[PDB]
């Protein structure tokens, strides 16, 4: 386990948005991907560059109330303030009561808990969210990672995103939901296991294999697929499968190229 | 596996409905049950008998973009048109790199993707949906299979269905959700495993045992029960457990008869 | 093995409705019923109210005569009495070579006839409670706390906190009722998405979560080591649906140090 240190900034963005960045003027929505191995400690030197209180709160990871990011625990950040947040992670192991301590590993996320309301409704709506992956020793690592956030009726706060791969690429997706509504995440031409890694461990793994998954606010899951496995290259749509949501125009493509670089035209 | 051929028709029905059928004028809502073993290939000679564009799109199974059933992938069908769709399935197994490839097996479904909207909102509403089961080698086979579809506030597009069995029958249910709303599927007197087959693989399988399940649009799961196991013969209701949904009167019965043919009075 | 309890449905002073083990002792949620796989429980039920009321259970083995429905003539007339029978079974091998799933799990009981023939009125007013069925060898907790998301309410409280000490094995039963989906979230803690809410071992691939989508009549549960790797503190649990959490209904898992103290918080 390594001790890692990063800077993070909350900033107002154009069009009434808010985002996290690794550097001032570089905030994105979603925020930057944070990747740890079980046992790693992360110190986030967080600077609130905004005129409203804001925080950093994380799902899944080990933190003390001093890093809750809540009003309740006085661990949000005043306008223009700085605070060091600490996230820890642990490997699984056998407890002295004979049980198995679940590790930190999994698909997680971070978001604001104080903009607009004491639940971060305003900050989340405006873009203060980002993905976190914690890996277990011997986890299969991907060729690329893509984050898809269903935030209210938006995808990654975009106007009313595409991801490119080549056939055979090991492609990871992080899938985070925020806001008021339930959604169903669907990907054409691909499927995954409903389990920790989104991949079956082997023949003894009875997890359902799905291409559709109901998600609600602050749900996070992830998976890896082999791009075009058994289906070939093409424009592979992903969408919410709630009919009226899918009808609002937000057509995302998983663009899987043949080895020569072509996609069967669309 | 085997190479199978079938014919499928989309037809308009009474009350502005649309159904799939294996023969002209035998369209049903839900559509016909398609059952495959992992490794089997299915060629569907699909005839759109209607006066609007229609398609056939499947979840879970292997298909090329030419069988996507979408306008994006030029694989919908003109009015009066014919198109051969091809569905493939695979068995699980280790890849070259030692990772486990999940099989096709599971509870799946097909539906229209181009009637009313480019997401099949009209076609789905009007009844262009059916079940698909892909079995693994050694899977327990049932005495009967019943399909229950929560389509918006309807069950199988019926106005505001019952299924008969004898005590000890192995009864399979396929549970598909479509449209706008989340639901909770509940069955009295019976329970199942929250996993691929709906049955525990044995004593190592940690899957939750449930009688109630949250489902969203395009969710599919299924399970087998022994009819009346440890509870006896009776009128065993299944219903959505969302209180306003269940109070609308959409409440079917799982009618489990004694071997003599009687049921306790209801 | 064969067990009996008394249960009463009561209109509460405030117009809510609850189950109790004794007259004028009704709670919302109702009393925790705990059974071992194989156990039979006879519930001598008395509806003390001026409206028909029932007892219906998820997950456990019961005949249609204990359905607690109008359809199966097993609701109770005002002032009436009825013995409901709940059976349970261990898992085992059927002759057909298949594995019969046992009764064990996080379950619940609720009214099926107050207001409507689906208990919409009873559930709304507080006629719900938790049932735990344990398998032989299941790990037992220092305490059990029941959290019910009932429409927009938690345990029908006005617009609940649970106290533990660091290292306590604390069990939560999480039931949902009514009209809306929700997402249950607990700060500082996580559990397995499986039967027990606890990973069996390194061979259990179950997702480890701190946030779960739940709909009406869903039940799950889990055990945590209070404050494990995170320390003493006021650990909030809440719905993560943003308009739901903003309504003010937020409970605290108050994890105290062994000297009875807690880091300062501002509720
Ligand atoms: Cu929170
Ligand atoms: Cu959606
Ligand atoms: Cu959160
Ligand atoms: Cu689609
Ligand atoms: Cu419903
Ligand atoms: Cu679909
Ligand atoms: Cu019911
Ligand atoms: Cu301790
Ligand atoms: Cu809620
Ligand atoms: Cu119920």
Q: Which domains does chain C have, with CATH numbers?
A: 1-138 (2.60.40.420), 139-267 (2.60.40.420)
Provide the 3-class DSSP secondary structure of residue B244: helix
Query: Would you say how long chain A is, in residues?
Result: 266
Q: Are A15 and A4 in contact (CB under 8 A)?
A: no
- Give the single-character DSSP code of A105: -
Nearest to C214 by CA among C112, C108, C121: C108
Q: Which ligand is nearest to the CA of C180?
A: 9
Query: Would you say how long chain B is, in residues?
Result: 266
Q: After which residues is chain B broken (C to N over 2.5 A)?
A: 160
Q: Does C120 touch chain B (CB under 8 A)?
A: yes
Q: Does A60 touch chain C (CB under 8 A)?
A: yes
List of long-range contacts for A136-141, beta carbons under 8 Å, 24+ apart: A136/A37, A136/A38, A136/A91, A136/A92, A136/A103, A136/A105, A137/A37, A137/A38, A137/A91, A139/A105, A139/A197, A140/A170, A140/A197, A140/A199, A140/A224, A140/B99, A141/A170
d(CA B93, CA B100): 6
With CB atoms and an 8 Å threshold, state whether A188 touches B220.
no
Furthest CA-CA distance within chain B: 60
d(CA B120, CA B55): 8
- The whole-angstrom distance between A18's CA and the closest CA on chain B is 30
The phi-psi region of residue B172 (left if phi > 0; otherwise alpha if psi is between -120 and 50; otherwise beta) is beta
Nearest to C65 by CA among A223, B67, B264, A110: B264
With CB atoms and an 8 Å threshold, state whether A217 touches C183.
yes
Q: Does C201 touch chain A (CB under 8 A)?
A: yes
How many Å lie between the centroid of ligand 1 and the Cα of residue C245? Answer: 9
For the record, the structure tokens of A198 come out as: 């989104």
How many Å lie between the centroid of ligand 2 and the Cα of residue A256? Answer: 24
For the record, the structure tokens of B237 come out as: 């209701």
C44 is in an annotated binding site: no
Cβ atoms within 10 Å, residue B138:
5
Which position has the token pair 């790990």? C139
Q: Does A254 touch chain B (CB under 8 A)?
A: no
With CB atoms and an 8 Å threshold, state whether C63 touches B237.
no
With CB atoms and an 8 Å threshold, state whether A234 touches B73.
yes
- Name, in order, each residue with C-beta under 8 angstroms of A32's C-beta and a sequence gap of 6 or more: A8, A20, A21, A22, A130
How many Å lie between the centroid of ligand 2 and the Cα of residue C242? Answer: 15
Which secondary structure element, helix H or strand E, spans residue A84, and what is its range?
A: strand A82-88
For the record, the structure tokens of C52 come out as: 């028909």
With CB atoms and an 8 Å threshold, state whether C104 touches B231.
no
How many Å lie between the centroid of ligand 9 and the Cα of residue B214? Answer: 14
Q: Are A22 and A10 in contact (CB under 8 A)?
A: no
Residues of A in contact with C243 (CB under 8 A): 121, 180
Residue in chain B closest to C135 (alpha carbons) equals B203
d(CA B216, CA B195): 17
Q: Which ligand is nearest to the CA of A214?
A: 2
With CB atoms and an 8 Å threshold, state whether C230 touches A205.
no
Q: Which residues pair with C212 in a beta bridge?
A: C184
- Neighbour-count burial for B28-42, b at 16+ CB within 10 Å, e otherwise: bbbbbbbebbbebbb
The phi-psi region of residue C152 (left if phi > 0; otherwise alpha if psi is between -120 and 50; otherwise beta) is alpha
- Name, in order, each residue with C-beta under 8 angstroms of A33's C-beta and a sequence gap of 6 or more: A130, A131, A132, A133, A145, A147, A174
Which secondary structure element, helix H or strand E, spans residue B245, and what is its range?
A: helix B243-246
How many Å lie between the centroid of ligand 10 and the Cα of residue A64? Answer: 38
Q: Are strands C2-11 and C40-47 parallel, antiparallel or unpaired?
A: parallel
- The whole-angstrom distance between C177's CA and the closest CA on chain B is 8
Chains touching A (at least 3 CB pairs under 8 A) are B, C
Residues of A in contact with C199 (CB under 8 A): 92, 100, 102
The CA distances from residue C5 to C20, C31, C110, in Å, are 10, 11, 16
Cβ atoms within 10 Å, residue B252:
18
Q: Does A168 touch chain C (CB under 8 A)?
A: no
Q: Are C19 and C129 in contact (CB under 8 A)?
A: yes
For the record, the structure tokens of C261 come out as: 């103290």
Which secondary structure element, helix H or strand E, spans residue C3, and what is its range?
A: strand C2-11
d(CA B151, CA B131): 13
Q: Does A180 touch chain C (CB under 8 A)?
A: yes
Furthest CA-CA distance within chain C: 60
Residue in chain B closest to A265 (alpha carbons) equals B73
In Å, how far from its chain's centre is CA B175? 6
d(CA B30, CA B127): 7
- Give the single-character DSSP code of C65: G
Q: Which residues pair with A85 in a beta bridge?
A: A44
Q: Are A82 and A46 in contact (CB under 8 A)?
A: yes
Residues of A in contact with B111 (CB under 8 A): none
Q: Does B229 touch chain C (CB under 8 A)?
A: yes
Residues of B in contact with A226 (CB under 8 A): 95, 101
C185 is in an annotated binding site: yes
With CB atoms and an 8 Å threshold, state whether B206 touches C195.
yes
Nearest to B131 by CA among B114, B153, B146, B141: B146
Which position has the token pair 């007892």? C55
Query: Would you say how long chain C is, in residues?
Result: 267
Which secondary structure element, helix H or strand E, spans residue B246, and what is its range?
A: helix B243-246
- Give the single-character DSSP code of B243: H
Q: Which ligand is nearest to the CA of C123?
A: 10
Provide the 3-class DSSP secondary structure of residue A193: strand
- Give the single-character DSSP code of B124: H
Q: Are strands A170-178 and A144-151 parallel, antiparallel or unpaired?
A: parallel
Q: Are strands B212-215 and B209-210 parallel, antiparallel or unpaired?
A: unpaired
Sort A51 into a burial class: Cβ within 10 Å, 0-12 / 13-18 / 19+: exposed
With CB atoms and an 8 Å threshold, state whether B178 touches A243.
yes
Q: Are B242 and B152 in contact (CB under 8 A)?
A: no
List of long-range contacts for C93-97, beta carbons under 8 Å, 24+ apart: C94/B226, C96/B140, C96/B170
Q: Are C231 and C198 in contact (CB under 8 A)?
A: no
Which position has the token pair 């039963």? C173
Q: Does C247 touch chain A (CB under 8 A)?
A: no
- The whole-angstrom distance between C198's CA and the closest CA on chain A is 8
For the record, the structure tokens of B266 come out as: 């209801």
Q: Are B13 and B52 in contact (CB under 8 A)?
A: no
How many Å lie between the centroid of ligand 4 and the Cα of residue B241? Answer: 27
How many Å lie between the centroid of ligand 10 and the Cα of residue B243? Answer: 10
A241 is in an annotated binding site: yes
Phi, psi dihedral angles at B66 (to 5 degrees): -70, -15
Q: Does B59 touch chain A (CB under 8 A)?
A: yes
How many Å lie between the centroid of ligand 2 and the Cα of residue A254? Answer: 18
Sort C7 into a burial class: Cβ within 10 Å, 0-12 / 13-18 / 19+: buried
Residue in chain C closest to A64 (alpha carbons) equals C230
Nearest to A87 by CA among A178, A2, A173: A2
d(CA C76, CA C72): 12
Q: Are C166 and C256 in contact (CB under 8 A)?
A: yes
Provide the 3-class DSSP secondary structure of residue A10: strand
Which position has the token pair 């919908």? B76
Q: Which ligand is nearest to the CA of C68?
A: 7
DSSP structure string for C208-247: EESEEEE-TT-EEEEEEETTTTT-SEEEEEEE-SHHHHTT
B188 is in an annotated binding site: yes
Q: After which residues is chain C broken (C to N over 2.5 A)?
A: 159
Question: Any alpha helices (H) in chain A, and if so which ranges?
Answer: 121-126, 243-246
Q: Does C203 touch chain A (CB under 8 A)?
A: yes
Q: Which residues pair with B154 in a beta bridge?
A: B151
The phi-psi region of residue A190 (left if phi > 0; otherwise alpha if psi is between -120 and 50; otherwise beta) is beta
Phi, psi dihedral angles at A28 (to 5 degrees): -130, 160
How many Å lie between the centroid of ligand 3 and the Cα of residue B183? Answer: 24
CA atoms within 13 A on the CB side of C45: 30
Q: Does A102 touch chain B (CB under 8 A)?
A: no
- Give the single-character DSSP code of A141: P
CA dihedral A249, A254, A260, A261 (to 10 degrees): 50
Nearest to A188 by CA among A215, A228, A150: A228
With CB atoms and an 8 Å threshold, state whether A73 touches C225.
no
B239 is in an annotated binding site: yes
How many Å lie between the centroid of ligand 9 and the Cα of residue C180? Answer: 7
Which secondary structure element, helix H or strand E, spans residue A151, and what is its range?
A: strand A144-151
- Neighbour-count burial for A184-218, b at 16+ CB within 10 Å, e otherwise: bbbbbbbbbbbbbbbbbbeeebbbbbbbbbbbbbb
Nearest to A211 by CA among B63, B21, B179, B193: B63
d(CA C266, CA C246): 16
- Name, in order, each residue with C-beta under 8 angstroms of C199's C-beta and a sequence gap of 6 or more: A92, A100, A102, B206, C192, C206, C208
- Name, in order, each residue with C-beta under 8 angstroms of C91's C-beta and a sequence gap of 6 or more: B200, B203, C37, C99, C100, C101, C102, C104, C135
Provide the 3-class DSSP secondary structure of residue A94: strand
Q: Are C122 and C28 in contact (CB under 8 A)?
A: no
Tell me the torsion sign for CA atoms C88, C89, C95, C96: positive
What count of CB pairs under 8 Å joins B to C? 129
Q: Are C170 and C223 in contact (CB under 8 A)?
A: yes
d(CA A18, CA A15): 9
Q: Which ligand is nearest to the CA of C228?
A: 8
Question: Any alpha helices (H) in C12-133, and if so which ranges?
Answer: 120-125
For the record, the structure tokens of A141 come out as: 């690592």
């Amino acid at each position: 386990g390594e001790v890692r240190r990063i800077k993070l900034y909350a900033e107002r963005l154009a069009d009434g948005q808010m985002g996290y960045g690794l550097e001032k003027g570089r905030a994105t929505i979603p925020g930057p991907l944070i990747e740890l191995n079980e046992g790693d400690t992360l110190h986030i030197e967080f600077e609130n560059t905004m005129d409203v209180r804001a925080s950093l709160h994380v799902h899944g990871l080990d933190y003390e109330v001093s890093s809750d990011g809540t009003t309740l625990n006085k661990s949000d950040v005043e306008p223009g303030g700085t605070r060091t947040y600490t996230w820890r992670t642990h490997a699984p192991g056998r407890r002295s009561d004979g049980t198995w301590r679940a590790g930190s590993a999994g698909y997680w996320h971070y978001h604001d808990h104080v903009v607009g309301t004491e639940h971060g409704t305003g900050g989340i709506r405006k873009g203060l969210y980002g993905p976190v992956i914690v890996r277990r020793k011997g986890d299969v690592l991907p060729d690329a990672t893509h984050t898809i956030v269903f935030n209210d009726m938006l995808i990654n706060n975009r106007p009313a995103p595409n991801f490119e791969a080549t056939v055979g690429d090991r492609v990871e997706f992080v899938m985070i939901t925020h806001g008021e509504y339930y959604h169903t995440f669907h990907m054409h031409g691909h499927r995954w296991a409903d389990n920790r890694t989104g991949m079956l461990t082997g023949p003894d793994d009875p997890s359902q294999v799905v291409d559709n998954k109901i998600v609600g606010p602050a749900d996070s899951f992830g998976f890896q697929v082999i791009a075009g496995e058994g289906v070939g290259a093409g424009a592979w749509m992903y969408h919410c499968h709630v009919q009226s949501h899918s009808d609002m125009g937000y057509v995302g493509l998983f663009l899987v190229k043949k080895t020569d670089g072509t996609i069967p035209g669309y």
